């Protein structure tokens, strides 16, 4: 893993466990790589604790800079 991406969306679920919290303009460092669907990743974060696992559509991340 250990691979970043930048939100180009907002990511934002309650009620779910498995859901990621992630504003556009972010980072996220996934553990996963070249997946289907949806994968998990870690919310780049200053204080410990914070959004540990979360999971998401590659489809509103990307790795390179916007437009």
């Known amino acids: ?3 970043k ?3 180009l969306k907002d990511f934002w679920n309650l009620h779910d466990p498995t859901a990621l919290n992630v504003r556009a303009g972010d980072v996220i460092t996934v553990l996963e790589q ?3 669907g949806r994968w ?3 919310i780049h974060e ?11 559509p590659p489809g509103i991340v990307e790795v390179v ?3």
């Open 65 to 67: 800079s916007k437009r």
């Open 1 to 3: 893993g250990s691979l």
């Open 46 to 56: 200053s204080q410990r604790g914070t959004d540990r696992i979360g999971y998401f």
């Open 5 to 7: 991406v930048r939100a």
């Open 40 to 42: 998990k990743g870690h």
């Open 34 to 36: 070249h997946p289907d």
